[PDB]
Scaffold this motif. Structure first.
Motif, short mmCIF file in Angstrom:
data_model
loop_
_atom_site.label_atom_id
_atom_site.label_comp_id
_atom_site.label_asym_id
_atom_site.label_seq_id
_atom_site.Cartn_x
_atom_site.Cartn_y
_atom_site.Cartn_z
N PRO A 40 0.84 -1.21 0.00
CA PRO A 40 0.00 0.00 0.00
C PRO A 40 0.86 1.25 0.00
CG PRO A 40 -0.77 -1.60 1.65
CD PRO A 40 0.53 -2.11 1.13
N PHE A 41 0.40 2.30 -0.70
CA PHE A 41 1.26 3.45 -0.97
C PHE A 41 1.57 4.26 0.29
CE2 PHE A 41 3.16 6.28 -4.11
CZ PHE A 41 3.24 7.48 -3.43
N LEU A 42 0.71 4.20 1.29
CA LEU A 42 0.91 4.95 2.52
C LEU A 42 1.36 4.05 3.67
CD1 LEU A 42 -2.23 7.21 2.15
CD2 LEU A 42 0.14 7.80 1.61
N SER A 43 1.78 2.83 3.35
CA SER A 43 2.14 1.86 4.36
C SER A 43 3.56 2.11 4.87
CB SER A 43 2.05 0.44 3.80
OG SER A 43 3.07 0.20 2.86
N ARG A 44 3.82 1.60 6.08
CA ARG A 44 5.18 1.60 6.60
C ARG A 44 6.11 0.77 5.73
NH1 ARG A 44 4.85 -1.32 10.91
NH2 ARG A 44 6.75 -0.58 11.95
N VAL A 100 -1.88 14.10 9.67
CA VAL A 100 -0.67 14.51 10.38
C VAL A 100 -0.17 13.38 11.27
CG1 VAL A 100 0.25 16.13 12.11
CG2 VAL A 100 -1.15 16.96 10.22
N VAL A 101 -1.08 12.77 12.04
CA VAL A 101 -0.66 11.69 12.92
C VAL A 101 -0.09 10.52 12.12
CG1 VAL A 101 -1.43 10.04 14.67
CG2 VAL A 101 -2.29 12.39 14.75
N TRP A 102 -0.75 10.16 11.00
CA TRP A 102 -0.26 9.03 10.22
C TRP A 102 1.11 9.32 9.64
CZ3 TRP A 102 -0.80 4.18 10.40
CH2 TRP A 102 -0.18 3.38 9.43
N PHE A 103 1.33 10.55 9.19
CA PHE A 103 2.66 10.89 8.72
C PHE A 103 3.71 10.58 9.79
CE2 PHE A 103 6.12 14.05 8.35
CZ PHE A 103 6.71 13.56 7.22
N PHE A 104 3.46 11.00 11.03
CA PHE A 104 4.49 10.78 12.04
C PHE A 104 4.52 9.35 12.55
CE2 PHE A 104 4.38 15.43 12.02
CZ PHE A 104 5.74 15.64 11.79
N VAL A 105 3.50 8.53 12.26
CA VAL A 105 3.66 7.08 12.36
C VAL A 105 4.71 6.60 11.36
CG1 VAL A 105 2.53 4.88 12.03
CG2 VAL A 105 1.35 6.64 13.29
N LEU A 106 4.65 7.12 10.13
CA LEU A 106 5.70 6.77 9.17
C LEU A 106 7.04 7.33 9.63
CD1 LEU A 106 3.80 7.28 5.77
CD2 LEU A 106 4.09 5.22 7.08
N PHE A 107 7.03 8.58 10.11
CA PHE A 107 8.24 9.27 10.54
C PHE A 107 8.93 8.53 11.68
CE2 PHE A 107 10.61 12.83 12.47
CZ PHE A 107 11.08 13.49 11.34
N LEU A 161 -3.85 1.90 15.28
CA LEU A 161 -3.92 3.32 14.95
C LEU A 161 -4.68 3.54 13.64
CD1 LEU A 161 -0.38 4.57 16.06
CD2 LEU A 161 -2.57 4.90 17.23
N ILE A 162 -4.52 2.61 12.68
CA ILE A 162 -5.20 2.73 11.39
C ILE A 162 -6.70 2.74 11.59
CG2 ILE A 162 -5.72 1.49 9.20
CD1 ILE A 162 -2.79 0.68 9.18
N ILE A 163 -7.19 1.92 12.52
CA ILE A 163 -8.63 1.84 12.73
C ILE A 163 -9.18 3.18 13.17
CG2 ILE A 163 -10.45 0.77 14.07
CD1 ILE A 163 -8.78 -1.76 14.20
#
Ligand SMILES: CCCCCCCC/C=C\CCCCCCCC(=O)OC[C@H](O)CO
Ligand SMILES: CCCCCCCC/C=C\CCCCCCCC(=O)OC[C@H](O)CO
Ligand SMILES: CCCCCCCC/C=C\CCCCCCCC(=O)OC[C@H](O)CO
Ligand SMILES: CCCCCCCCCCCCCCCCCCCC
Ligand SMILES: CCCCCCCCCCCCCCCCCCCC
Ligand SMILES: CCCCCCCCCCCCCCCCCCCC
Ligand SMILES: [Mn+2]
Ligand SMILES: [Mn+2]
Ligand SMILES: [Mn+2]
Ligand SMILES: [Mn+2]
Ligand SMILES: [Mn+2]
Ligand SMILES: [Mn+2]
Ligand SMILES: [Mn+2]
Lengths: 207, 209
Positions: A2-6, A57-64, A153-155
């Motif tokens: 998935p394109f936004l996945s870790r 924003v939160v999901w970005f910093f999950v990746l970050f 967190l995704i949920i």
């Protein structure tokens, strides 16, 4: 992937990490900066109802979150302090996610049962991780759960984001996500305690 | 005092871990029924009662020839749940039955930090480091919040501001404590020894400290 996945993001963490090292940042400073940015985003955007922007924003910093390890790998290794700091910072970040959403739900919606659900998610979010840490502090194992922390967190973030989705929002999604996460999290707590119980040396009596 | 009570509970067929779970369930039920109704003195007494009751699992384990590692983990986890319920119950009263939004923030800071303070210690120990000390541990936490709550609602001569004084004091002290304990992690022997980071995942390229 998935394109936004870790898993997708792991394809570019090396150049990002090299860039940040080059500039003089360390893994642990990056953990703290990302956590601070994540908390700022959750506590600014969620209490205002900007749930889609907050979720992004939160999901970005999950990746970050993945950058400190990539940086430490480029530097020759991580540290135990870095691991404790990462975990602790993750607790704080998660706490801010649920506190931000809680503020919106408690004071700008008419759904008192959903407040209860959000508080269950908030507390179980901490306890799920605490069981594993506390078990390992005693030489036991404490992992478990059909659904891991990023997916949990995704949920909630998906529910929040869809509830506030640009142009075509579905407001019920926030409640659906939160109750699903509450049920999943309570179960995860019991499953993890069961892992502690079945760990080597867990039930020998001593002293 | 504790030995006769413990021996009696063992004869009933209760075990340390069952008593831990029951005491925690009762504490949670007290906090979540009485605090949201504004019965802060009664709730504080109920919670304090089961704090004292939580000491019985150790007395029982002694009478049994010792406790277990599992029991220790269960007891500590139950303590987190009980602390969570205390702040959730009070949060509900403060949020929906008072006009003090800053106090809601202080209560949420207490809620989150009560978990994180304990977490730092456990997680440090899981890596062979230390994360102990600091200003606020559970006995100071409970004394401050339950005293503020009880005094705010005290029979005959309440002092309402006490709820807010306690929560703000605990909020500030608890943040400081998180910082203190992370410094203790940093100074622990071996905390900054370099360690090789093996990749995790099926592709062995997920890197975590
Ligand atoms: C238009 C772009 C958004 C379209 C998507 C719906 C948006 C939902 C709202 C906010 C995103 C917050 C959650 C983003 C979660 C992505 C999780 C994911 O991609 O799964 C991989 C994960 O790392 C392992 O499963
Ligand atoms: C009754 C007033 C009690 C207030 C206790 C505050 C001070 C407590 C001591 C140290 C914390 C200092 C940090 C103070 C930051 C809190 C500022 C604030 O917003 O006070 C509003 C309060 O909720 C209104 O009841
Ligand atoms: C060192 C670790 C400690 C870090 C812990 C941080 C985690 C978040 C906890 C509490 C903040 C929750 C605040 C909820 C957002 C409030 C936003 C708001 O609108 O405030 C209203 C204003 O006061 C109108 O009077
Ligand atoms: C007016 C509300 C907009 C505030 C956006 C600030 C959010 C902070 C994001 C952290 C990065
Ligand atoms: C009038 C309604 C009153 C609601 C009180 C607030 C409800 C908070 C719900 C969260 C409770 C925190 C304790 C969570 C217990 C989870 C147990 C985990 C299983 C091991
Ligand atoms: C708008 C809200 C902003 C709140 C900021 C939240 C900060 C979260 C990050 C906390 C990280 C703790 C850092 C302390 C490290 C202590 C190490 C000292 C040893 C050298
Ligand atoms: Mn990280
Ligand atoms: Mn992390
Ligand atoms: Mn982790
Ligand atoms: Mn994790
Ligand atoms: Mn006990
Ligand atoms: Mn206990
Ligand atoms: Mn202690």
């Amino acid at each position: 992937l998935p394109f936004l996945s870790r898993a997708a993001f792991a394809r570019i963490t090396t150049p990002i990490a090299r860039g940040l090292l080059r500039v003089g940042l360390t893994p642990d400073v990056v953990t703290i900066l990302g956590t601070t940015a994540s908390v700022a985003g959750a506590l600014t955007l969620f209490p205002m109802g900007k749930l889609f922007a907050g979720a992004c924003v939160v999901w970005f910093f999950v990746l970050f979150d993945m950058l400190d390890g990539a940086m430490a790998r480029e530097r020759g290794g991580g540290t135990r302090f870095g691991a404790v700091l990462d975990a602790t910072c993750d607790r704080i970040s998660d706490g801010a996610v649920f506190c931000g959403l809680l503020w919106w739900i408690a004071f700008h919606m008419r759904d008192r049962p959903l407040v209860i659900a959000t508080l269950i998610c908030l507390v179980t979010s901490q306890v799920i991780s605490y069981i594993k840490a506390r078990a390992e502090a005693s030489g036991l194992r404490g992992d478990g759960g059909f659904i891991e922390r990023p997916e949990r967190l995704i949920i909630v973030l998906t529910g929040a984001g869809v509830s506030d989705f640009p142009f075509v929002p579905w407001p019920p999604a926030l409640s659906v996500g939160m109750w699903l996460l509450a049920v999943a999290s309570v179960i995860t707590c019991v499953q993890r305690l069961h892992t502690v119980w079945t760990s080597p040396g867990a039930i020998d009596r001593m002293a």
